[PDB]
Ligand binder design. Sequence first.
Ligand SMILES: [Zn+2]
Ligand SMILES: [Zn+2]
Lengths: 358, 358
Amino acid sequence: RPRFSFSIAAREGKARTGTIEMKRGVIRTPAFMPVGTAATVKALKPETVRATGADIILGNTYHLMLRPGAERIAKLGGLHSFMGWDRPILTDSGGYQVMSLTKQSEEGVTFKSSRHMLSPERSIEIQHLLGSDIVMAFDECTPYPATPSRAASSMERSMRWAKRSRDAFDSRKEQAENAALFGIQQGSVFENLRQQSADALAEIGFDGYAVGGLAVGEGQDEMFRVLDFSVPMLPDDKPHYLMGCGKPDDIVGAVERGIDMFDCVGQAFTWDGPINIRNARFSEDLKPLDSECHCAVCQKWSRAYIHHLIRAGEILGAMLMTEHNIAFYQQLMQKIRDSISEGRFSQFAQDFRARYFA
Amino acid sequence: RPRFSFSIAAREGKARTGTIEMKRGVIRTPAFMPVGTAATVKALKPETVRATGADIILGNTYHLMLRPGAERIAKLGGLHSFMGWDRPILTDSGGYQVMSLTKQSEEGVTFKSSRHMLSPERSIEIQHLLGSDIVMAFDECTPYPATPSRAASSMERSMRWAKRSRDAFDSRKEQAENAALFGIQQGSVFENLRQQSADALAEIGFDGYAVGGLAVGEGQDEMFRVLDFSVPMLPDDKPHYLMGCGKPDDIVGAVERGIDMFDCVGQAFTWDGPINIRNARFSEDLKPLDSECHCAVCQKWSRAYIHHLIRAGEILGAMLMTEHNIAFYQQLMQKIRDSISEGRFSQFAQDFRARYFA
Ligand SMILES: [Zn+2]
Ligand SMILES: [Zn+2]
């Protein structure tokens, strides 16, 4: 396989389906990437993650640099070897997590976990040490709400940092030849700033483009409104990645708006909407979590059992709930991919919402 | 298969190896039974429990009657169906756990979790509702240390309760025809009381005999001393079960003394003794938890990774540590079974201790 090749197989409106080929594997798009914060997808073996249908998982520059350490993971053979996942891994750059979980300057950010530094150069270096396949540019995630002046200043700094990310990536031969680099669009909810950001990123040139600065409390209506004008600003022939949860209804609407990639960190998803398994009404419910789901959890255990496990604080409860929820997300992505390929995605979206919100 | 058939295939000194046949499966002895407190073997799917080599698991009358409830589990189809384990299950009677985790009388014990009652009759009924395959008599676990007078009074009550357990079991046709009933020897550390207890239990007649009242703080030397004279008092042609951890060295010595069955609830077992994986010296150790172990954990992940997971409080850490530890115990039981079958168990015991304690 090549270092990176994005191919679009079919389209419906703004929606696309296709494949990203990378050295460690093929990624089917639209894709959902389970999040593996501390070098683990919570409560799941990698083999189980793969069994649910995941093609790629996400890791985080910030969390891994704190524990166990980036240099340490490199010495031990890299993140793939360390955690036992041999398929592509996307790593976030730390731009978000430092701020949510400190001293900022044009050079970068210094923070306390134990003091640490992040810059475009150090963030790209850490992702190299981890051995990540899709490297994210180091940005500044603009708080919401932001004034136009503040959003502009932040966006401009992020674009300067996008250039530094690009050059740091390119100057490291093993990384440039084997991994890909995605830029991150900023600009808050302002169309002109999003346009300037897209223009800057396209001029620099990246393997993919993320829509950053959303899923930060603005609500689905606002997110969709911003995606409406922001995604068409991005190069059409590269993947589009919406950063952040990422609930099932968010994913459907975002795919309708041209997004190709997604992530999201007692709640069980079903085609009839989410349920909270802790609720007393499930204590003697022999049905599986969802009636149609083909995951192993729904083939074997009842709502009643999982209700008991979660209530009792049992680890198996978390294992089963997580496997089901990630498998549900993958089944959603498969239905989306199939429906786009067959030119019936707009109908699928309508059907999905009718039932999910009934 | 029959309701219950214990066959001894080979012997070496006091040690025996053979099989217990029951309707839900065959149990190879000497056996280790993983403990599944709240209708789950902690952090493991039943399929994983089976993969480590377990033939039977343990459940508890006390814990299950409190949560989710015995009547509830019966309504939902029984414990096997509820948790997804279809092989034999042994259930303790509550005799121990009520006392460690209250008003006593000749009739039974009343306690607060929410007030509850246990008697020989109610304990046997609960085990029936759970659908357990090996039912334990309801006893009183004598505290240690105990005076001879107190040990005698307690032992005598337990023997009266053993008779009530027997009659309650026999009066319930579905239970008597499909499950087995084990009696529990008491008498503390006193030979004459252990003899009286064994005589009483043998006169009543049980499918198997447990040595109770040990693993309660007396230490290995004392436990072994008591097992030295207690086990030969038990009927030779029925299984002998030592209640309670149950560390690997305890198991070897207890098998040398004629015990057939065992249970035990950052520590990883290795053939060179236990290690605590949290220790900093494992932070960059690429070796598996144990060099010889053939479990899936040792085939795939390093000490360094598991060290990281446990330190970080990650659920996968618990999953991997538990799978390894239970698999190690099963590999120990297999080596014991093989060595007895081949008449070289006394040598194996010596070799095991030399290395484990080196
Ligand atoms: Zn499911
Ligand atoms: Zn192992």
